[PDB]
Amino acid sequence: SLSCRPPMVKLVCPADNLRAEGLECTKTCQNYDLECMSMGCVSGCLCPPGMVRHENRCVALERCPCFHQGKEYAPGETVKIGCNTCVCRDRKWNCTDHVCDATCSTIGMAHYLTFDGLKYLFPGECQYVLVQDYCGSNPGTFRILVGNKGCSHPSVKCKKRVTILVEGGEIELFDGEVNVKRPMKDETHFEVVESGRYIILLLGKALSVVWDRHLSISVVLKQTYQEKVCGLCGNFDGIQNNDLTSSNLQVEEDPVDFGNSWKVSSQCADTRKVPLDSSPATCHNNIMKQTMVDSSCRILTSDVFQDCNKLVDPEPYLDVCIYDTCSCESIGDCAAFCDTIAAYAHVCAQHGKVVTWRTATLCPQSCEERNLRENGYEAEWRYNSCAPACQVTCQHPEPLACPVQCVEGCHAHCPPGKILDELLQTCVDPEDCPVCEVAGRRFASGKKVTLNPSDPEHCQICHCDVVNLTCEACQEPG
Amino acid sequence: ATRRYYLGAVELSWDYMVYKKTLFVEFTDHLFNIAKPRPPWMGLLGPTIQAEVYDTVVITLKNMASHPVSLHAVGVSYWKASEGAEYDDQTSQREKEDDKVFPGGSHTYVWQVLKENGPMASDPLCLTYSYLSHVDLVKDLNSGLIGALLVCREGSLHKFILLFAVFDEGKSWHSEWPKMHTVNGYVNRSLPGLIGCHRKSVYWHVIGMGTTPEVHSIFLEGHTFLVRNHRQASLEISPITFLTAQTLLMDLGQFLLFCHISSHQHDGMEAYVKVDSCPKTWVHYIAAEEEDWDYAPLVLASYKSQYLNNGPQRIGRKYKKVRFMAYTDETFKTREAIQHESGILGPLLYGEVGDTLLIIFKNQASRPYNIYPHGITDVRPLYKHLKDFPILPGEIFKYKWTVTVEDGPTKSDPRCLTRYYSSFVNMERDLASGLIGPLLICYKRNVILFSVFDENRSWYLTENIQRFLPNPAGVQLEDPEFQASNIMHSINGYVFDSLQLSVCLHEVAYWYILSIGAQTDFLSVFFSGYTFKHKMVYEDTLTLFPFSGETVFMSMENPGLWILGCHNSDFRNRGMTALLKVSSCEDFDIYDKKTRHYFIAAVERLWDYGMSSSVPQFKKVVFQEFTDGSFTQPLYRGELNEHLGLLGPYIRAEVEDNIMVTFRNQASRPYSFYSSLISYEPRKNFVKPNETKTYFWKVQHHMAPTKDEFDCKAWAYFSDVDLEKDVHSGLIGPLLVCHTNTLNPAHGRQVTVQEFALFFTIFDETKSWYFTENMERNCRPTFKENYRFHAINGYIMDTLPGLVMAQDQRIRWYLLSMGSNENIHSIHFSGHVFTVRKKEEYKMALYNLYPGVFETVEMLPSKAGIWRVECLIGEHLHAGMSTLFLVYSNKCQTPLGMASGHIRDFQITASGQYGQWAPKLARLHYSGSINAWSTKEPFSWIKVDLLAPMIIHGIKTQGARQKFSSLYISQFIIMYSLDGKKWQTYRGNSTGTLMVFFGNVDSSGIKHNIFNPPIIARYIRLHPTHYSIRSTLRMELMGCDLNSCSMPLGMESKAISDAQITASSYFTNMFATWSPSKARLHLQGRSNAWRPQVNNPKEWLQVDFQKTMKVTGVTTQGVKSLLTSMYVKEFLISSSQDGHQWTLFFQNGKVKVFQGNQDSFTPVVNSLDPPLLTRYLRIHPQSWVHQIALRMEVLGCEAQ
């Protein structure tokens, strides 16, 4: 009755050894490298010795497919996920990969989206720890705190201040401006670039800050800090549901307590628990206003954002949009509405799906205010929904590792062979920039370059006055 | 259409020509006060229920008796709420009201006649069935609760119902007593009004009723019966039989309808039928001559000593018989050359339709005799009746026999009908004296007679006593031992292999086999090693009722010395056997002239007939399939063949294939492997213990089904060392022979249909080869009742497993019966009908199984649930001849609660765990730092303990991830159980000893593995064979309940019409319209839930299905609208049948409060432990969060 149709080899248990591997130990592309745990020998049909079994068919070992999310790939094929790319080789993924990263976002007036995708609402008026590495055993490298003033129920005139301490340097982001109160010890990797509507601050190899100059604060950290950071942005462990862990290593069920646990200054009063008001003042007892808010926020799931609905979760962004628009008197001039839509579009474009949603009817933007072609500025200011944020300029001649692929706003296109200058806001010759060059790296005037930071015998600090380069030996503290 | 019948079980006093009987009576109104008139010819029969193929029958049964009754119908289809029979079908108490109707109560049964229940193209205008009370089959049948059910073709709506019933007053409901053999409840020709038309043909819907195996032969004098366009001399009524007969009345006057069995002459199954207006000539000279006949010439002699050796009180072989002899001339001087084969038979008479037989008979014997044919009607003198006219010795008479049209075979019958002629002066005495001759009635020749000559009834007994015995004075005629030696069981007058027919190899032979004599039981005639073409189909065993003949066609392709006999043990051992001498005169898909090798052994095992489900254990011998020729590892029998029980392995083959069976006798006494299909080219088919034998042959067209019948045919194989004791010891098995390209090359079976082989027999442990050992082990006129088991495949009392089939698929049933004459089994599938194929297609619902015959039927189950296949013989069913089979639906495949939390944490266990990765976390989509079961050990297992047995259609497995590693189970096997003690590994469609499932390749992908055929279990168990790092599992069981009621009723799929949902009030404004018709589950949009205008605890949402449905669970869900999470947290449920009479769903005596949602997005399902049979459903919310909003989904099924 054990009729194995050829070329399938029949295996029958000796019934005496009681140790031979039978049919249970079927080899498969899934489990070729895995040890068999057999209770006892099973008799049955098997693929010939040179082949393994794949679903309902026998395939050669050289043609075993590699596996990925709900899919199979033939050997030699390539795939790309996140920051990494891999090739199918011996049922494995041989990867030529970079270092991935994740972004924690301050969405809306008082909404926080952690690195693990957890979104919560916390209308705290205190100054809180946005993200810090001081979590038990800590190296103590960076600490970013956020302070909100006016983000209560009358959140129309709210303001946010970002205080960043890194390598002994203090940076304050406020009123759409960046002030370096104390210079960092190593300024080689410290860069601040202004591209379009956004400002990108690189504060090291794995620390990036993105600001929309009004309300959107994004902290980009590489995966090396998967188990080193803590705060309002979570512990970066990859688990969404445990981001509500307080500073005392206790998970808080109420987000208000989790937010209050990371208070910096005890002078300010703690945020008390308030029942969730679904309809604020403008939307309270106003069906028409709520309908208008819902219709305005429905654009996040429209045809223009159709390609993004399969990549980025639209529920938290839609909730933030509704909550912010229900506090605005009018939708046309609602700054929070446009800022939330711009942040969502930026997130969508970070995955490769750029959406051109802006129009004169809804959140109009134009570059004609700065396109002073007749005023001696030889630059072409054009609006772009996603343009590179690390374009070479006089202030940034050396290419930089941009944390984001592209950003939205006005960019100054130049004639070929020219370089933009932000101080003069115009395109000039590449040699006209006040840029020095050392060790193959070009840096604008006023910048400090550190060579051999860990070698006292070769440590050098180089400065550029205008075009002359002056390098001095580093002073030994002792 | 719809037909209303008002039935009442009225308890009356009945006289057959005064006992107390309960009878179904038809009334006129629903008040059951006025009884509808019934014609006098019906008697004890209830009213005739006639239904067309597209009708529905509604019967209101009121129990006016002192005992419970019911209405169990045969032939029609119905739901479990109208079956009328009580057994372990796992239905609700609302579906149990049909089972018993206690006195004073009432019930309503609805029977649907479908296209499946209609007569086929070949079946007559109306199929015949019966309804009957089924509370206690023996008492209900013997009390008179039986009625006719005529299923006619559409447009069908003269004909008579005939109930040939043996009412045993000792087993009725009023017994707390003779057996009355009656026609429609009347005995001794007292049945009136049975009129018929002069020339018009009359249809008889014959129902034979009886609680004990008791066959009947029904003759109408001067008439024949057309059954399935086959001409027959009589009706062969089995104890429970449905058939349709057609009789062409031609002669005016009164004729007798009677049972011809001699032992039933005093019983009185007689009635009168009043018919009223509404060229070749053979010449034969035959003489009756007295002569000495040697019943066993050239035989050297125990049975042989008792029957053949002469002694002081033993006559011996020779007896003075009287015999018919053929003479060449009128002067009666020279006899024609006699043949050794014909034996005691007279000259063979032949006649075609319209031919005339000119018979000239001279009574040359010393006693008056006569000659008269059976089957031939027009018998006249050449120049009361000639039947009783005696011919004085020395006289000469001339008869003229005219073979008319109503005597010859039809185009469906064989070319020649086998009849006889004999003396009708004293039928039994003249027949026992030796006057019998063969007759052939053919349409425009090896005769074999199985005859029991009772010499004690012969007219020449005194002369034999005075001649062959030394002391005639010292002869005790009443001595049973002396009388036994005179009852000669012979073939053509030859006893103990004194007859040897020799036929040529590769020739065609017509055998006319006849069964006349003192025997009152049917005979199971067989030719060892030969299949023969009877009624246009190749069969193996011929069932011969007394006084009947059958024509058989066969080709003598099997050479050797074979034994022709009958499967009656006493007759076989009393010398009713004859000898028959035959001699010459690259990647590929695993699934997408050959020899089919098998390895069967005879093994000794303990068997308790399924009574463990002190219990006696009997040591039996069975056929056992092994993997290979070493016979050291038996082949595992899985889900598909678990129904076999005691039956042996399926030996499947096609035409032109080679069967090679290696048979090893591992038992304690010699056995054999015998099948009638084993061909050779005598032989000692005798396998000693610890010896092997190979049976190799080629399957030919005579071993296969014809082009008309089903794709496979079933044959029986068994041990032939002792045909009776070896069957009682448990040696029997199915051999399937199928058409070409009908078996799957990879699996070896026909996967288009699903096949089940049922073997019904009464095992008698007193007749087994191990009776002494069984008595010694167990026992440390009711003694034999404790050792007889009316089993199906060796199982009694609904304990046979494995009969699980899918709805709307085609099922092929191979039905076998083996044993003595008591094994006439009236096999019935409750609520289901099937088709049989001889040369046409016939629709049936009952089948009478005769020992040695392996029938094949095919059905299509339409209703889901647990049904019963039983034997309608009251005593066999009461002794436990029944079993349960489940018809599941593939549609009902719903989560079993692993992810929904319905399976609590105490129902999940495991061999162990690693850290805090508890087995209770092994749930699909479970999220967390520790979100799965996981163990750091090899050879683990995770067990889910479902609270009740249920159907498992598949399992959805999922791994998990740790800090940087993915953990999953790549390969696993599945075990399951119903009590937690015996674990049976899953096999399904596998080619090996278990089904191997493949698991996950990552930590998030859901791997869905199917169970087909499904699992029917209470416990399930997963054993990981391969795992990545640790055996981590997040699983989800997909399944259903036994009655297949767990699927949604059409809210999430929007199958419910928008006009079918309403409410007391709904909240609407200029923008949002929370209409009730938008409360469907998982509905996405604006105002996607029902919300009343005013929030109050007296609101309700009403769903109307416009038809009776069964609700078994309600799934509720909330909404999140305008950042407000509104959802009902507690609610109650009410039901109504018309919309204005509502009742709250109370549980345990008080109203049940259903726990709603904890969050608006996760649905929660509350299952009603008692099913709710309703048309109108209402949900009343009690506690609501932030508003009264509810999205609902009803779980259930359809009903009547």
Ligand SMILES: *[C@@H]1O[C@H](CO)[C@@H](O[C@@H]2O[C@H](CO)[C@@H](O[C@@H]3O[C@H](CO)[C@@H](O)[C@H](O)[C@@H]3O)[C@H](O)[C@H]2NC(C)=O)[C@H](O)[C@H]1NC(C)=O
């Ligand atoms: C195990 O074997 C059974 C039967 O051999 C398999 O079930 C059968 O699967 C076939 C699909 O190849 C089904 O046929 C389909 O039927 C539908 C409905 O009539 C028809 O529309 C399709 O065109 C197709 O013919 C068949 O119904 C089904 N029968 C049963 C009883 O399930 C099963 O899939 C096998 N499972 C495994 C895991 O091997």
Ligand SMILES: *[C@@H]1O[C@H](CO)[C@@H](O)[C@H](O)[C@H]1NC(C)=O
């Ligand atoms: C992966 O590919 C590179 C380049 O083809 C090769 O050098 C290397 O051996 C491969 N395997 C691994 C494990 O890197």
Ligand SMILES: *[C@@H]1O[C@H](CO)[C@@H](O)[C@H](O)[C@H]1NC(C)=O
């Ligand atoms: C019927 O006839 C039989 C014999 O002919 C007789 O013994 C019996 O008493 C009669 N009546 C009944 C009711 O059986």
Ligand SMILES: *[C@@H]1O[C@H](CO)[C@@H](O)[C@H](O)[C@H]1NC(C)=O
């Ligand atoms: C048959 O063989 C078994 C072991 O294989 C042995 O125990 C038994 O005695 C043998 N029976 C015989 C030789 O009759």
Ligand SMILES: [Ca+2]
């Ligand atoms: Ca986390």
Ligand SMILES: [Ca+2]
């Ligand atoms: Ca029932």
Ligand SMILES: [Cu+2]
């Ligand atoms: Cu029976």
Ligand SMILES: [Zn+2]
């Ligand atoms: Zn009878």
